[PDB]
Amino acid sequence: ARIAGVEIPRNKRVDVALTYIYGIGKARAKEALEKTGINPATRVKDLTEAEVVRLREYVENTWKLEGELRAEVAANIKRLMDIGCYRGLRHRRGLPVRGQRTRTNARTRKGPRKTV
Amino acid sequence: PRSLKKGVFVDDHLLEKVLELNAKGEKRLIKTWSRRSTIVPEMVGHTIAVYNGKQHVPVYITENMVGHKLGEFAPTRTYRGHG
Amino acid sequence: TMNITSKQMEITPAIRQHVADRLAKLEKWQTHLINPHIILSKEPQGFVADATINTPNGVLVASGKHEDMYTAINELINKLERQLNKLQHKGEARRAA
Amino acid sequence: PLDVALKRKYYEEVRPELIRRFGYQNVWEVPRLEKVVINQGLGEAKEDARILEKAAQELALITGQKPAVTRAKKSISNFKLRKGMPIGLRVTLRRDRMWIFLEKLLNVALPRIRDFRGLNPNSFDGRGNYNLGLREQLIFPEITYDMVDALRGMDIAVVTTAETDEEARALLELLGFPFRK
Amino acid sequence: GKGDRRTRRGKIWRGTYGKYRPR
Amino acid sequence: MKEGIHPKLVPARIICGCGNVIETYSTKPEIYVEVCSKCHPFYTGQQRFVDTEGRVERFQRRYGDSYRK
RNA sequence: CGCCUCCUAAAAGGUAACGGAGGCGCCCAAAGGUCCCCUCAGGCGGGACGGAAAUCCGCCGGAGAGCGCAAGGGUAGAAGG
RNA sequence: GGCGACACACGUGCUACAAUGCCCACUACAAAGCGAUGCCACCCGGCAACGGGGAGCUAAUCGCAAAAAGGUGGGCCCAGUUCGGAUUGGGGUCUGCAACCCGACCCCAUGAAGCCGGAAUCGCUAGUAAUCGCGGAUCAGCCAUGCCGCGGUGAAUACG
Ligand SMILES: [Mg+2]
Ligand SMILES: [Mg+2]
Ligand SMILES: [Mg+2]
Ligand SMILES: [Mg+2]
Ligand SMILES: [Mg+2]
Ligand SMILES: [Mg+2]
Ligand SMILES: [Mg+2]
Ligand SMILES: [Mg+2]
Ligand SMILES: [Mg+2]
Ligand SMILES: [Mg+2]
Ligand SMILES: [Mg+2]
Ligand SMILES: [Mg+2]
Ligand SMILES: [Mg+2]
Ligand SMILES: [Mg+2]
Ligand SMILES: [Mg+2]
Ligand SMILES: [Mg+2]
Ligand SMILES: [Mg+2]
Ligand SMILES: [Mg+2]
Ligand SMILES: [Mg+2]
Ligand SMILES: [Mg+2]
Ligand SMILES: [Mg+2]
Ligand SMILES: [Mg+2]
Ligand SMILES: [Mg+2]
Ligand SMILES: [Mg+2]
Ligand SMILES: [Mg+2]
Ligand SMILES: [Mg+2]
Ligand SMILES: [Mg+2]
Ligand SMILES: [Mg+2]
Ligand SMILES: [Mg+2]
Ligand SMILES: [Mg+2]
Ligand SMILES: [Mg+2]
Ligand SMILES: [Mg+2]
Ligand SMILES: [Mg+2]
Ligand SMILES: [Mg+2]
Ligand SMILES: [Mg+2]
Ligand SMILES: [Mg+2]
Ligand SMILES: [Mg+2]
Ligand SMILES: [Mg+2]
Ligand SMILES: [Mg+2]
Ligand SMILES: [Mg+2]
Ligand SMILES: [Mg+2]
Ligand SMILES: [Mg+2]
Ligand SMILES: [Mg+2]
Ligand SMILES: [Mg+2]
Ligand SMILES: [Mg+2]
Ligand SMILES: [Mg+2]
Ligand SMILES: [Mg+2]
Ligand SMILES: [Mg+2]
Ligand SMILES: [Zn+2]
Incomplete structure (x- = not known):
């Protein structure tokens, strides 16, 4: 369950992928990739584990996602x-x-x- | 919803009676036709009878139902289902 | 399905069901009855039963009239049948030459 | 036997606290871990791809122990079930392997559990044993997304030498079992 | 297309403005 | 143990995102995990991730005391 | 209409009626020989999907389970797995 | 308060199911209309709806105003998706005495059905159909995807 609770689509650009999280839409996708300085165009297969946990850490603390959101x-x-x-x-x-x-x-x- | 720049709307004639009852200690039943009035923190614990077009519906206000309108708790249509 | 209109009249579910059992006679011809529409109405002379029904081979339009609402409906059915039977058989007439 | 952190933590910290909390007069009287039994209820492998060898390969990576097949005691109509049918997997962990499994279970697995709010405090034997069930095998660090065909969870029995739930609650929590209430 | 508010085309069809169609 | 039917258990590093490293035993000597007990919100005191909100509602409106008295 | 089990059958055996109830006309290449090992049903508590009942854990539980198939006898100190 | 109800059924329409497409960014080309508690340049606050400033125009002067398809670049790669935008949660704006029933709009999140539609059936013969946007009456606001107009791009086919 890479990030964040959900295993986002590899092969796809990180901005598009991120939207496969409950609570993260296109708006919030462009946001997290700025605040962590990651190219929004890069594919999830091509992220650095550095970037992953970078992207991970911000996204999971800034906003309520998946389970707790549905709750x-x-x-x-x-x-x-x-x-x-x-x-x-x-x-x-x-x-x-x-x-x-x-x-x-x-x-x-x-x-x-x-x-x- | 109503502009935040503007007020938190209560019909004054409803509100006035609330504060009147608050002072002396509450409470008698309050018959009102003011569906448009917000439940306001001062109203909590009262029971206000809200006219739905036909009947006055007794509504005991609680801490959960503050932000809402009075009409929201006295439904205007009788529907028990079809067939 | 089947629609029934009671123009400027009140009728019952019973009466509505009656009409449905009466239109049902048309099922005889084993052809598709598409959006049958019955309009019940009251003139000074008696009732009027109107109907428009489409089928793969044409439309049926008929009006029945009579003091007794049921007879008015029955005559409507009679006129509809005669039309449906023509629609279903007129093509057979000229098979030769 | 291997030096393992959790096992060491049991003797160094857990035992003294337990001796303290209940005042046992014998070293043997204090709560011990007897075995951890893992069970895959499966039976979705009754017929079909009755190759649950995929699951056994998974269990073995998790425990370092190859599970043994369980078979239907009797035949059952409604579950579509004939006697002798291979319906599950069961592995009995003891000693060093038991410690190693629990070690990773607490540190890694339970955290990776979806919307984890803590273990269920009420799930105690009444006789001093505990049981919990999992929805996925992906919880474990051994299993990755690539190598897994479908989602199958398990049952986990933790058996203690403790006579009461109270004592067992004491030991397990001390070890690091995270309870919600 | 024209039915999605969160897009330029949608705001045109609807005749409004916003982040997704500014003026 | 019966020979040749079991995966061998070797020393292992489980590496979490928070920088936690766990010295343990496994069938894979190196493993990366997104989370561990050391960083997980339930464990860490009560580190309430995104929402330590506390409802906030419903008298939490207070906008404001302006109606007449 | 032959054969098996129980009862009638009067505490040895046997004992009739168009007396009361059920079975058989097969089966098994292991369901046979032997050596080794193992012990049930059921009740309660605990456990993802999982249910009255699938598999797992604990406690109680001498035999009420099992023994291909009727019934009876026998039987875990095994004839059962 | 209701005309806005909702087991159901039919009629008219809107948006779609995608690559002759969708999204972003930049860049062109209309007509007819409307406008003094009106139309609003331009400025600034706000992601925005909008708000506060503020010039012009009894309007071939000033304003609504940007037309959109298109053009040029970049992304998407055939997936229920960067197709579709329903449903719902939350936060705001504006009108209005007042948006609970029952307003429109913005923003965050949610992201349904739908993979081109049975019997049957509608329109259109040329600047037509199709497709693209613009205006106006009504009008505090608007449930307009309606109606009456306006231009842009621009076919197929008619043996009989
Ligand atoms: Mg999303
Ligand atoms: Mg009808
Ligand atoms: Mg009527
Ligand atoms: Mg009627
Ligand atoms: Mg007529
Ligand atoms: Mg007749
Ligand atoms: Mg005729
Ligand atoms: Mg010892
Ligand atoms: Mg308990
Ligand atoms: Mg115990
Ligand atoms: Mg894992
Ligand atoms: Mg869209
Ligand atoms: Mg050996
Ligand atoms: Mg005898
Ligand atoms: Mg005898
Ligand atoms: Mg005798
Ligand atoms: Mg005798
Ligand atoms: Mg003898
Ligand atoms: Mg006889
Ligand atoms: Mg054998
Ligand atoms: Mg043998
Ligand atoms: Mg038992
Ligand atoms: Mg049970
Ligand atoms: Mg269950
Ligand atoms: Mg059970
Ligand atoms: Mg027996
Ligand atoms: Mg009204
Ligand atoms: Mg109406
Ligand atoms: Mg409604
Ligand atoms: Mg009906
Ligand atoms: Mg329909
Ligand atoms: Mg429409
Ligand atoms: Mg339609
Ligand atoms: Mg497709
Ligand atoms: Mg979908
Ligand atoms: Mg579908
Ligand atoms: Mg989409
Ligand atoms: Mg809302
Ligand atoms: Mg309203
Ligand atoms: Mg079509
Ligand atoms: Mg099409
Ligand atoms: Mg057809
Ligand atoms: Mg013509
Ligand atoms: Mg189009
Ligand atoms: Mg228009
Ligand atoms: Mg106008
Ligand atoms: Mg208007
Ligand atoms: Mg509406
Ligand atoms: Zn960690």
Whole structure:
């Protein structure tokens, strides 16, 4: 599990690879490679273990990633669900939360169609 | 959400009653139509009845539900499911 | 599936189901009934039952009319059948020469 | 026998603290490690690629000991299981190999465990033994991403001469077993 | 393309501006 | 031990990222690991990596005391 | 309709009825000979996927398991692995 | 408060499933319109939305304004991906008395279905179709992917 908890794609440029971490998108990819002075274009197979632990150390301390991140988002939802607010209710019934129409669509949230 | 440069909005007529009850010691039930008012730290521990268009829903405020709006806790539609 | 509209009228699930069992007679011809649409309506004279149905060999459009909503529906079905039977057999007429 | 840090740590630091904490009157009375038994429940190798020789090669790299096949006591319908079928691996570690395995387990393995919050304090025999289970073999330093085809974990039995969970808790934590609660 | 906000093309289609399409 | 069926155990260095070196025994004499007990957040006191946040919410808003009284 | 097991069968053997219940018409190249080693079912507690039940660990557990197949006898101080 | 509901069903559309493509950076070429508690140059703070300064223009003068496809370079290398941008978490902006139900926008993270679509079915005969962007009415703001316009690039085919 090289970095950071996840084994990022070798053969790929380090900036693109880093996005294969939960919590690290393209924005944060360009950030960590500056702050550690590593060429963003270089492939993960071509990193130095010096650079790896360099890249590793910064990325794992600056931001919340993978497990602990998922834990929070859930707790945040678990919270809204428990305090019983409207946003909460939508999560409890698995319905859309950001005020979308549910007469049609809402399939991403509802899942594939249930016959009647 | 509402600009941080602006206020933390409470309808004053709702808020006033809170502070009034805080001073003398709380609490009687407060019937309000102010769904748009933020739950504010001064309100915690009270039970405010929030009109949802039909009924006034009794809402006991807690430490968890501070940042929210009052309407969020008195749902406006009755839905028990389909079929 | 099948859609039913009750224009400026209220009807029941029962009545809706009745119509579905009545349109079902068209299943006889073993051809695809594509988006059948029934419109129930009330005139001063009686009820009106409209329908538009498409099939691989054409469209069916028919209107039934009668004081009794069920008869209006039955006549709608009768007109739809006659059309469907023509759609399904008219091509056979000129097989010779 | 080999000079190994953990083993040395047991005699030099752990034993005196235990003698202290419970006041044994005999040197033999103090909690000792009897064996570490590793078990791969497998049985995903029942039929199919019943070559679990891949797994045995993995276990052997981890322990330095070649595991022995376990076979079904009886036949079972629902697990799709006939008597005598090769369903798992089991290796009994003692003495120097046992110390070496635990040594790497504490220092390296458990840290590499995903979202590790510490061992489960309640997982004690009641008779002074402890058990923990793993989801992956990748946890161990011997195993790399390259050389592994699929994810198979294991069961680990740590057997102690301690009569109670209390005593066993004392010994294991002293050795460096990291407990959450 | 045009549906992704975090891109130049998306901000054009939507008629807005930002980091991914500045003015 | 039965001969020829076991991997030989040799002296070994396990090298962690934090600079920790572990003198131990293994079937591979040199090994690199991303983490060890010496640096792992759970072990090191309670070194709370990125978030030693402490919620921060929910009265943690305090923006501010400005409503009238 | 021959054969095997139990009961009827009256504590030796034997004992009938169109009396009460079940089996057989095979099988095994080891499921045979011998030497060596090993000991169950089950209950409780513990253990990734793993479940009432797969494999692992501990404790209790004389035989209630096993012994190809009916039943009976026998049997771990082995006939069982 | 509801018209925004949501086991379902149909109609119209938007964005797509990628390399004749996607992303970054630099660089060209329109038309028709709109604009004094309006359109906003330019400056500065902010990654940004935006905010604070501030000139011009009763507008062939000043402003919206940059058109986009394109062009030139660089990256991506056939993968559910640097395709796609749904869903959700968190943080902000602006309008407005007020954005819980029920606004638009920005930023961080999340990164779904979808590998070109059954029966069936729509449009178009030339500056048309296709594809690209620009404006306006309504309008505090906007749920516009709609509507009415505007130009850019620019086909295939018609035996009968
Ligand atoms: Mg990512
Ligand atoms: Mg809605
Ligand atoms: Mg209908
Ligand atoms: Mg009606
Ligand atoms: Mg009706
Ligand atoms: Mg008509
Ligand atoms: Mg008839
Ligand atoms: Mg006719
Ligand atoms: Mg000793
Ligand atoms: Mg316990
Ligand atoms: Mg013990
Ligand atoms: Mg490893
Ligand atoms: Mg994209
Ligand atoms: Mg020898
Ligand atoms: Mg007898
Ligand atoms: Mg007898
Ligand atoms: Mg006798
Ligand atoms: Mg006798
Ligand atoms: Mg005799
Ligand atoms: Mg007879
Ligand atoms: Mg044999
Ligand atoms: Mg033999
Ligand atoms: Mg047992
Ligand atoms: Mg159990
Ligand atoms: Mg389990
Ligand atoms: Mg079990
Ligand atoms: Mg028996
Ligand atoms: Mg309303
Ligand atoms: Mg409406
Ligand atoms: Mg329906
Ligand atoms: Mg459909
Ligand atoms: Mg649309
Ligand atoms: Mg459509
Ligand atoms: Mg492809
Ligand atoms: Mg994906
Ligand atoms: Mg798919
Ligand atoms: Mg992508
Ligand atoms: Mg949010
Ligand atoms: Mg709203
Ligand atoms: Mg197509
Ligand atoms: Mg296409
Ligand atoms: Mg067709
Ligand atoms: Mg024409
Ligand atoms: Mg396009
Ligand atoms: Mg437009
Ligand atoms: Mg306008
Ligand atoms: Mg407008
Ligand atoms: Mg909306
Ligand atoms: Zn370390």
